[PDB]
Ligand binder design. Sequence first.
Ligand SMILES: CNS(=O)(=O)c1cccc(Nc2ncnc3[nH]cnc23)c1
Ligand SMILES: CNS(=O)(=O)c1cccc(Nc2ncnc3[nH]cnc23)c1
Lengths: 262, 268
Amino acid sequence: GLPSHFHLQLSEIEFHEIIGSGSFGKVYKGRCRNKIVAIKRYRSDVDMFCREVSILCQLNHPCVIQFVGACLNDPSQFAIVTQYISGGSLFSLLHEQKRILDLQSKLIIAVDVAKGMEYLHNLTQPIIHRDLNSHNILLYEDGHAVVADFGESRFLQSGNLRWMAPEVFTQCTRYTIKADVFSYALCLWEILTGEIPFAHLKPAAADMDMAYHHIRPPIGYSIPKPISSLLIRGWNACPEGRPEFSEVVMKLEECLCNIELM
Amino acid sequence: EKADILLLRAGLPSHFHLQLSEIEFHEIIGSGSFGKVYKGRCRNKIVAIKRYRSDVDMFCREVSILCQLNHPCVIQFVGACLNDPSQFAIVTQYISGGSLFSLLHEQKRILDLQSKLIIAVDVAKGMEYLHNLTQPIIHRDLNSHNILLYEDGHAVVADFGESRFLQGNLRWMAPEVFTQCTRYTIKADVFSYALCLWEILTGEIPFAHLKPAAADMDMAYHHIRPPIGYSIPKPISSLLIRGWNACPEGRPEFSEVVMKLEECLCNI
Ligand SMILES: CNS(=O)(=O)c1cccc(Nc2ncnc3[nH]cnc23)c1
Ligand SMILES: CNS(=O)(=O)c1cccc(Nc2ncnc3[nH]cnc23)c1
């Protein structure tokens, strides 16, 4: 049921330099069907590969990664091919390169991300990214941005509770699209400040501070009042209080107009 | 299934083996998706029987946990019927003073502080026992329906139907997802116990005016707790504030809960 045009023989892929690595295997830069591509090569695990592919073959939007195909011939030859995006991750730009950005460049990125996410959330069968962060926002050289890496992505699912611990309640509850809005909020703050949320903490300390002790990255004069309000609602502890991505896109586009006019 | 029942039959001490024909079933005293709970009679002894409606794994596990139990603050297993899946039953002691839920919310009876603390302490001990076994057991369904009361004023934890033997990038995660990454720990019972302790002190069902799922929601997403009046003694309010800490790591162990409540009984 993966449309047959998306099937790939390994012979259709030219592998070049390695560009990423992890548990799954390796990511390579390469060439496929007359394009420059990123190829995610592989070494319970098969279900996750099949999910990712099922999701990648639904994608068609300029603010979301472009799928090229997958190789399914046998388990040792598994691979996912996408367009290569040469401008790097948003993470690198802000934290490693420390390129100084004007406010217009920042909003273009954040809007492009918000649009990609709006797209995903409003398909007939909605998609939750579940891993949205600055490592998974890639940038074109022109400053436009796309949402990448759908390895954690899932299709949206269609007495004792009164005495349940919150962490237990949360586990018996369905994972929603509003969890993507939370993560986005952090990315949006991260774009404006150019700082890693909770830079001084290791990942898990940071998550605990957010979940248990309500701490949020500090807002200041670095963030104008139309946006800062989106950030606050965006990372509300109650999912239902969080805005829809359609709302996020309009407000950021309005800000983008006014910053171009000024 | 046939292999699991036979293995269970083999590890289960002989006195616990029962035939469904040896059980007399009087009235219904408990309910659930699993089946029903009865008052009844077995070998001429007044007993409580859980009757049964994935279901074999559940039965083998519940019986397994039950025959490990040997502590006066925790339900006394009497036996099971494991003849075949159609006949699945679980027999325990019957306790004539009823559930804490009944006492507080149906009979609406008034208790003095000492009587309350004895209950709270017995529950705490029972949970301490479970949590400190060589193979810890987590209860997972601790509430006022599942705390039972002898007429001498002591209590036991009952219904082990939900019980189990205890076994990125995170920086950008939503709190309700970060929490989906950790499993059910012992500290989840402590939280449940906290509400029971508030329930005992006030006589009110936690979030009485909301439906369960809304109470859960208010507690998880909005971080709301039942109000802690000025009338509640400090050492107990301290236990509540900590016991239902949203941070599991910040909730006390039951041994500490026991220790603190025992002190109060020495001042009471
Ligand atoms: C392989 N397709 S994927 O599932 O979306 C995916 C997963 C993990 C990391 C990437 N990275 C990049 N992909 C493309 N271009 C780039 N330039 C700099 N990093 C990448 C992509
Ligand atoms: C069958 N044993 S069980 O699984 O622990 C169990 C589960 C659910 C409810 C009970 N009730 C009572 N059990 C004993 N005495 C009582 N007096 C008033 N209600 C009960 C017992």
